Amino acid sequence: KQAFVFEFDENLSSSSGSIHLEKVKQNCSPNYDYFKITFIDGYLYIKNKSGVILDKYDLKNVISLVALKRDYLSLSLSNNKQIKKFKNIKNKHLKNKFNLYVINEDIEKRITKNGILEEVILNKMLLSILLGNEENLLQIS
Amino acid sequence: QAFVFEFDENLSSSSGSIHLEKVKQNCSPNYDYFKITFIDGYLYIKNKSGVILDKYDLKNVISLVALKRDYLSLSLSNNKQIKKFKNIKNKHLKNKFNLYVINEDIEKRITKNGILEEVILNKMLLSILLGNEENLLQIS
Amino acid sequence: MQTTTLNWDTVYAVPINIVNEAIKLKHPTPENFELLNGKYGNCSGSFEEWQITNGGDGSNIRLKIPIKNFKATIIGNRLNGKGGFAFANLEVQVKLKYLPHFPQSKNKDIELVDLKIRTQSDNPEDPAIIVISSYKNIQGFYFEDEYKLTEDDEFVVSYFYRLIKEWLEKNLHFFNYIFNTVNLNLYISDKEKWEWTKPSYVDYAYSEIEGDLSRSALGVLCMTGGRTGSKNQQQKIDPYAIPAASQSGFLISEERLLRNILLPTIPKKFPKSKGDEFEVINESSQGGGYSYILKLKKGKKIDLENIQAVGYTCTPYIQEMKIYLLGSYLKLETTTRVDLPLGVASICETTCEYKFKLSTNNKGEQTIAYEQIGSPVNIQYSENTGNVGLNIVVSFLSATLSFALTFVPGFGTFLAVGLIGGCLIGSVALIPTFIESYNSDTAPSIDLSLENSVSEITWNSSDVFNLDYVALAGPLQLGGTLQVQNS
Amino acid sequence: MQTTTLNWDTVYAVPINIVNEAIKLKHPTPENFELLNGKYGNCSGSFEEWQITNGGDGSNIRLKIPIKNFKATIIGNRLNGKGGFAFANLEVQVKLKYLPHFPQSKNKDIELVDLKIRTQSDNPEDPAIIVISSYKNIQGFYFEDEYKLTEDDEFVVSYFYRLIKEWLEKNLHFFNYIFNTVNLNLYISDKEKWEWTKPSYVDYAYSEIEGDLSRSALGVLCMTGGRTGSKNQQQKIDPYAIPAASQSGFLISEERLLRNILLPTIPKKFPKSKGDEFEVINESSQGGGYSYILKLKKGKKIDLENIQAVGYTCTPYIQEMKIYLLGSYLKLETTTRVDLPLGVASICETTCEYKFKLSTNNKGEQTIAYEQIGSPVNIQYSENTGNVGLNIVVSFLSATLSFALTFVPGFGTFLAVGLIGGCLIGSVALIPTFIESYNSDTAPSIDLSLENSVSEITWNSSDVFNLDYVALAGPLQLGGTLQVQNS
């Protein structure tokens, strides 16, 4: 598949939509793979403690750049059973096995022009939909 | 796990579905044996009047055939990806792989009725199989 | 050309043309037949003798049955009429079967069995007589008002054929013929000579090459020495079982040559051996088929006669060896190693090759001879770990080369003569004496050997096998002509 | 352990601990900081010394930035309030950059470049500063939220770090530590010595292995001799670059040793030859990316000095050879062939091995010595198309064996001493004279070659490389300790 569903839920923000992923050719970090994430459609919601929507940001066409250690390539097994999502488990922090990090959450600053708040939340969202789902990256060219 | 067959001839007709399977054997190492089981269908014996002189239910008839393993060279390239066992009406085709019938009706569900039934069934089996041996390539 | 027994112990292959000839000769007279009061109709006609024709495989045999002056009356609610033909070939498929031969042999140790057409079967999935839809060269066909043979009435002929089958099924003598007769040795034990060529289990195979009957063969397949058949065995003949030079062929599995002749013999070449160092195994890459080798067990070595080199009494040893059958050769590879205590290691990998052939002794009797092909091929690996002086190193390696170049051909000769010995005298225990006194001029006749091998199977009641070829082509391979009695 | 330069010419690997220790000694980290009048908030605090920490790779460097006595005001419509922490360890990711050194070199043939943190970037896909999402050892966190904070203090902390990042964006230059300094020899030509060790292009790499930091290194990677970088070069250091025995490691590519020292030198061993018969290629086994070997070009042979052999004057020749670097060794394999006019050919495949080590001459000066490891290992075989008798063949093979055992070590000795020659004197033209008159007691000091190789790179402004180790481990490998000028 080209596009993937993503879902993110936490107490003060949530997001969903679909993303396109592609490997980024690079020669500066031989032990890491770079991936470019393009948001095809989606919204980022900021909510209060009781779930009321305070703000929302259209993610459409936002572009993110991430990297992780090529240890993930040894993940088994790339089998189709069945539909892969980039989903997080609400309030369940996970281990970062492959030193996944975000290089730039919004390259063209479509949302982070709004300020640090958006950057920080977008950064958190990216790590949270990726971590634990790295086996999904195996099929990305 | 099924295939549709269509057999059309001047004095004899047949339609339905069959289930084929490879028969393990250790007596003819250059040949593959197949067990054909008729899931559904009827065998029509007709005159030139084209009416129904006799109608036999092919249900559960079991047939056994063999052919030269050379057929395994065949390249299927499923196109158009739907495969039936259909004879080409009134056009006797070649037997590339020395295909032959070992038993037309093992339990004699139909052939108990005499020699004519053996003859017709034997002719029918060769007709639906010949030309269509490429279908066999996917039968375990 | 290298051939194989395909996991059988012995294989006896004869061209189909030769078999059909004996059949025709023994049944020259046509036979009138008639079927009256048949449920599905009646018929009458004349047979000529059946013949094996192409299209068979393994157990399955095609027969061509020529029929002339045929008439039939068909009965049924559905079809009904009188007809016939002037000539047609009925083609059927049958199997053959080994059956006890009568009278029984006087020797209660042997069961004579005959190869004959299997006339009856109680298994619905394996009919005794299968009619093949072949409307070849039918002449003078007619049925009621129709005197032409059309596609629309070809089924009438199929009906005729099954009326003829009805007669055949009730008149089994039509199929009488003894293809061959085999001495099954029921109770084989160690005490018998040539145990490896005496059949204890037998089956057959029809093998056709390119659909050409003239290049096709019927084969007798035997397990010997008390072995019986298994899933390991197939009803198949190698294309090259029969020598190009000869009419008919007989093969003895190189497995049996190696396991039963050389393996028990080889320790007698080595006085310093303990006797348990050697084995015969099936070698291969990824999966194993028919390639056998006589070798040392893993971890084993053989000490040899001591040599004197550069002032030292040294003990050569064999750390590795391979004896096997490839193409026309018995091949020997032997790795010999010698260490000089000062710190020089010598390792020679030496290879020798042997052909076998038909020959004669002083008495003009047929026998088996061998010859070494070319000179030993040697590769010498050396190491100097004591930083020994040049002259000593060079002299030492020269001595150990000299040793290998004489010892290894000696070992090769032992094996070749030993192999011939087992073949000719049949008693393994007698082979070391045979080697010691071997002489081309003096070598015993192969006749006793044949009596216990090929002649364990008799074709066409009384055919004699006339040997005209012997070679190694993987298995030991015999070529000869079947002589029919009463010339 | 065999190592590799991974297609670079020269490699200089220093443990990260040494680099960090140097930073804490020079205290380049700014003390107090404050962001005033920011749109999204403001902050202030104190830094403790910045240090390289784990998680980087190649270009990418992770810095631990410990912060204390921190407070910040957050300004926003949603998140808004004042807070701080007593201590935190901020982790960022940055890159380093080579910049023109000042004051420049007077020699305009040499361009001095400094390795320093990259402070800015105009490529959005390559931020100068990346904040890492790590919240380690945060003490005394506090924040007064005017509305919402169900998600933890982690969120506020991430916001704080971005405020600190805003200050960093404008103040990273405050951290002007020079990691190392490199002399770029632009314009290398004519009679230049040691051209294969004079850098013409330089880059760097962080390398970590699990077990971290203690075993992690910062590497200076150079292309030399006018060569430049390419996609062929990766920012990576082999795990075995630094001798286990030493603090820091310097590597000179085996490819350069072969192309620039031995390849021009080896013809001078055979004034018989034309001089165009040799080549350095990429084909050898097994691990890594690829290995380099010096061999005869296809089709070529090298006539050697004549020998007497069983009454005939024969010319041995080199039919094939391989010079290559394996484990701890310079290895030479030479295949010599001799053809006897009687029609027999001798073939010897002879392998010799040489180690290098740090040594001293009689003036107590450090130098490079060598030694042959054991004796030649040999393989000998033959071809006999003339049907020549065994006795002649054996005597013939003795003579050719003796020649190989004498010639090939002499060949290896020439190569070993030739290579020391090139390393120690840096001029190809002078090597033959060096070989001819070599003497380990009198061999020149390595100091001049160090000036032109390793000391072309200067760490921590004024470090001096104290050599304590030399070996061949694929590429020439130097082991040593950085001496920090006490001051």
- Cβ count near D228 (within 10 Å): 8
Q: Chain C residue closest to B29 (CA)?
A: C58
Q: Does D378 touch chain C (CB under 8 A)?
A: yes
Q: Pick from C416, C437, C458: which residue ends a domain?
A: C437
Tell me B98's DSSP state.
-
**Spatial CB neighbours of B105, under 8 Å, sequence gap ≥ 6:** B61, B62, B63, B111, B117, B118, B121
Q: Does D55 touch chain C (CB under 8 A)?
A: no
* Backbone angles phi and psi of B56, in degrees to 5: -110, 130
Which residues of chain C does D381 touch, with a Cβ-Cβ cutoff of 8 Å?
377-380
Task: Look up tokens 């157990």; give the residue.
Answer: C59
d(CA D71, CA D142): 9
Give the chains touching B; criterion: ≥3 Cβ pairs < 8 Å: C
Q: Which of D443, D481, D476 is nearest to D460 (CA)?
A: D481
Q: Does C372 touch chain D (CB under 8 A)?
A: no
Name the method of structure determination.
Answer: X-ray
Q: Do C124 and B100 touch (CB under 8 A)?
A: no
Q: Which of D251, D240, D235 is nearest to D95 (CA)?
A: D235
Closest CA of chain B from C26, distance in Å: 29
d(CA B60, CA B68): 26
Geometric angle at alpha carbon C435, from C432 and C441, rounded to 5°? 150
Which residues of chain C does D374 touch, with a Cβ-Cβ cutoff of 8 Å?
384-385, 387
Which residues of chain C does D380 touch, with a Cβ-Cβ cutoff of 8 Å?
379-380, 382
Q: Is D289 in the same domain as D392?
A: yes
Q: Does B49 touch chain C (CB under 8 A)?
A: no
Which residues of chain A does D126 touch, with a Cβ-Cβ cutoff of 8 Å?
103
Q: Does D41 touch chain A (CB under 8 A)?
A: yes
d(CA C403, CA C292): 28
Q: Which of B132, B21, B65, B71 is nearest to C130 (CA)?
A: B65
The backbone region for D400, taken as left when phi is positive above 0, alpha when psi lies in -120 to 50, beta otherwise, is alpha
Whether the link from the prior residue into C168 is cis, omega within 30° of 0, is no
Q: Does C382 touch chain D (CB under 8 A)?
A: yes
Q: Are strands B54-57 and B31-45 parallel, antiparallel or unpaired?
A: antiparallel
What are the C-alpha distances in Å from D275 to residues B54, D271, D293, D317?
97, 8, 18, 15
What tokens were used for D324? 């290559």
- Cβ count near C42 (within 10 Å): 19
Q: In the structure, do chain A and chain D come into contact, i.e. share 3 or more CB pairs under 8 Å?
A: yes
Looking at this protein, which amino acid is placed at residue D360? T
d(CA C49, CA C24): 6
D479, D464 contact by CB (below 8 A) = no
Task: Look up tokens 């038993």; give the residue.
Answer: B103
Q: Does C393 touch chain D (CB under 8 A)?
A: yes
What tokens were used for C426? 């049949």
d(CA D44, CA D40): 14
* Backbone angles phi and psi of C373, in degrees to 5: -95, 115
- Cβ count near A113 (within 10 Å): 10
Q: Do C125 and B106 touch (CB under 8 A)?
A: yes
D323, D331 contact by CB (below 8 A) = yes
CA atoms within 13 A on the CB side of C47: 24
DSSP track, A72-107: GGG------SS--EEE--TT-----TT--EEEES-T
Which residues of chain D does A49 touch, with a Cβ-Cβ cutoff of 8 Å?
148, 150
d(CA C480, CA C478): 7
Q: Is residue C110 part of a domain?
A: yes
Q: Is residue D370 part of a domain?
A: yes
Q: Residues C364, C368, C371, C372: what is their CA dihedral angle, to the nearest 10 degrees? A: -160
Q: Do D380 and C382 touch (CB under 8 A)?
A: yes
d(CA C57, CA C219): 11
Looking at this protein, which amino acid is placed at residue B20? L
What tokens were used for C276? 């348990």
Q: Is residue D379 part of a domain?
A: yes
Burial of D108 (0-12, 13-18, 19+ CB in 10 A): exposed
Cβ-count burial C199-220 (b if 16+ within 10 Å, e if not)? bbbbbbbbbbeeeebeebbbbb
DSSP track, D395-416: HHHHHHHHHHHHHHHHHHHHHH
Q: Where are the beta strands (DSSP E) in D165-252?
A: 180-185, 199-207, 217-224, 248-252
Most distant pair of Cα atoms in chain A: their distance: 47
Looking at this protein, which amino acid is placed at residue C485? Q
| 3-state helix, strand and coil shares in percent for chain C, rounded to the nearest 5 | 20, 40, 35
d(CA C368, CA C11): 19
Q: Chain A residue closest to D77 (CA)?
A: A117
Q: Is residue D317 part of a domain?
A: yes
CA atoms within 13 A on the CB side of D258: 23
Closest CA of chain D from A6, distance in Å: 21
Q: Residues D213, D215, D218, D222: what is their CA dihedral angle, to the nearest 10 degrees? A: -160
What are the C-alpha distances in Å from C215 to residues C18, C53, C57, D168?
11, 12, 14, 92
Q: Chain A residue closest to D134 (CA)?
A: A101
Specify the length of chain A in residues.
Answer: 141
What are the C-alpha distances in Å from D233 to residues B107, D87, D283, D455?
76, 41, 19, 23
* Backbone angles phi and psi of D428, in degrees to 5: -55, -40
Q: Which of A129, A60, A121 is nearest to A92 (CA)?
A: A129
Q: Which of B22, B117, B23 is nearest to B61 (CA)?
A: B117
Q: Chain B residue closest to C55 (CA)?
A: B98
CA atoms within 13 A on the CB side of D86: 3
Q: Do C159 and B119 touch (CB under 8 A)?
A: yes
Closest CA of chain B from C347, distance in Å: 47
d(CA C396, CA D378): 14
d(CA D335, CA D339): 13
What tokens were used for C336? 């010999």
d(CA C431, CA D355): 57
What tokens were used for C370? 């061998």
The total number of structural domains that make up chain D: 2
Closest CA of chain C from B77, distance in Å: 28
Cβ-count burial D11-50 (b if 16+ within 10 Å, e if not)? bbbbbbbbbbebbeeeebbeeebebeebebbbbbbebebb
Q: Which H/E stretch holds residue C454?
A: none
Q: Pick from D436, D456, D475: which residue ends a domain?
A: D436
What are the C-alpha distances in Å from D29 to residues D24, D102, D168?
8, 21, 12
By three-state DSSP, how is residue C424 classified? helix
Q: In the structure, do chain A and chain C come into contact, i.e. share 3 or more CB pairs under 8 Å?
A: no
Query: Which of A12, A54, A102 lies closest to D150 in CB terms?
Result: A12
What tokens were used for A62? 């936002």
Burial of D346 (0-12, 13-18, 19+ CB in 10 A): buried
d(CA D226, CA D224): 6
Give the chains touching D; criterion: ≥3 Cβ pairs < 8 Å: A, C
Q: Where are the beta strands (DSSP E) in B3-131?
A: 3-8, 12-23, 31-45, 54-57, 62-68, 85-86, 100-103
What tokens were used for C221? 């397949």
Which residues of chain C does B126 touch, with a Cβ-Cβ cutoff of 8 Å?
133
Query: Which of A30, A107, A119 lies closest to D58 in CB terms?
Result: A30
Which residues of chain D does A104 touch, with a Cβ-Cβ cutoff of 8 Å?
124-125, 127, 130
d(CA C156, CA C131): 14
Domain holding C278, by residue range, is: 256-437
D179, D115 contact by CB (below 8 A) = yes
Q: Which of C429, D342, D165, C159 is nearest to A105 (CA)?
A: D165
A125, A87 contact by CB (below 8 A) = no
Q: Is D424 in the same domain as D297?
A: yes
Q: Chain D residue closest to C388 (CA)?
A: D375
Give the chains touching C; criterion: ≥3 Cβ pairs < 8 Å: B, D
Resolution (A): 2.0
What tokens were used for B33? 């044996």
By three-state DSSP, how is residue D116 classified? strand
Tell me C189's DSSP state.
-
Q: Is D170 in the same domain as D272?
A: no
C477, C394 contact by CB (below 8 A) = no
- Cβ count near D299 (within 10 Å): 6
* Backbone angles phi and psi of C429, in degrees to 5: -60, -25
Q: Is residue C190 part of a domain?
A: no
- Cβ count near D401 (within 10 Å): 25
What are the C-alpha distances in Å from B88 to residues A129, B5, B52, D122, D444?
59, 12, 21, 73, 95
Q: Which of D126, D98, D123 is nearest to D113 (CA)?
A: D98
Whether the link from the prior residue into D68 is cis, omega within 30° of 0, is no
d(CA A31, CA A54): 41
Geometric angle at alpha carbon B102, from B99 and B103, rounded to 5°? 130
Q: Do D158 and A124 touch (CB under 8 A)?
A: yes
Q: Is residue D24 part of a domain?
A: no
d(CA D399, CA D387): 19
Which residues of chain B does C58 touch, with a Cβ-Cβ cutoff of 8 Å?
27-31
Specify the length of chain B in residues.
Answer: 140
Whether the link from the prior residue into A82 is cis, omega within 30° of 0, is yes
Bridge partners (DSSP) listed for residue C303: C317
User: Which segments of C61-173 does DSSP mark as H helices, in order?
Assistant: 154-170
Geometric angle at alpha carbon B100, from B66 and B44, rounded to 5°? 115
Q: Is residue C222 part of a domain?
A: no
Q: Is residue C474 part of a domain?
A: no
Rg (CA), chain B: 15
Hey, where are the domains in chain B?
3-138
Looking at this protein, which amino acid is placed at residue C88? A
Q: Residues B16, B21, B22, B27: what is their CA dihedral angle, to the nearest 10 degrees? A: -70
DSSP track, C195-250: GGGSEEEEEEEEEEETTEEEEEEEEEEEEETT----TT--S---TTSS-TT-SEEE
D324, D280 contact by CB (below 8 A) = no
Which residues of chain D does A29 touch, with a Cβ-Cβ cutoff of 8 Å?
57-60, 235
